């Protein structure tokens, strides 16, 4: 007997993604994590989007 | 006698500007105001950047 995810995973646009979508036709996922770890001066992230 | 601004105006870019400049090579000034007013649905800004 094995454990499996009972439902699909949900991925959604944060508003900072939507504004970049409108402006430059592009989104970087997990945007706030990128900005926080960039301004904090740290190279590596805990998880991918 | 007339009043004048005593010092140059110090304008600095927010971290979202930094990450957008790194990624797409572009910046929207007063970026957080754009995000908040766009998401809230307010059509107009009080002042320019």
Curated annotation (Swiss-Prot), chains A, B:
Q: Where in the cell is it found?
A: Virion; Host nucleus
Superkingdom of this protein's organism: Viruses
**Annotated signal peptide:** none
Annotated family: Belongs to the herpesviridae major capsid protein family.
Q: How does it assemble?
A: Homomultimer. Makes the hexons and eleven out of twelve pentons. Interacts with triplex proteins 1/TRX1 and 2/TRX2; adjacent capsomers are linked together in groups of three by triplexes, heterotrimeric complexes composed of one molecule of TRX1 and two molecules of TRX2. Interacts with scaffold protein; this interaction allows efficient MCP transport to the host nucleus. Interacts with capsid vertex component 2/CVC2. Interacts with the small capsomere-interacting protein/SCP.
Question: What does the protein in this record do?
Answer: Self-assembles to form an icosahedral capsid with a T=16 symmetry, about 200 nm in diameter, and consisting of 150 hexons and 12 pentons (total of 162 capsomers). Hexons form the edges and faces of the capsid and are each composed of six MCP molecules. In contrast, one penton is found at each of the 12 vertices. Eleven of the pentons are MCP pentamers, while the last vertex is occupied by the portal complex.
Protein name (database record): Major capsid protein
Tell me the stretch of the parent sequence this chain holds.
295 to 343 of 1370
């Amino acid at each position: 007997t094995v454990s499996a995810p009972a439902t699909y995973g949900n991925f959604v646009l944060s508003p900072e993604n939507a504004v970049t979508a409108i402006s430059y036709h592009s989104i970087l996922a997990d945007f706030n994590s990128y900005k926080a770890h960039l301004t904090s001066g740290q190279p590596h992230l805990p998880n991918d989007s």
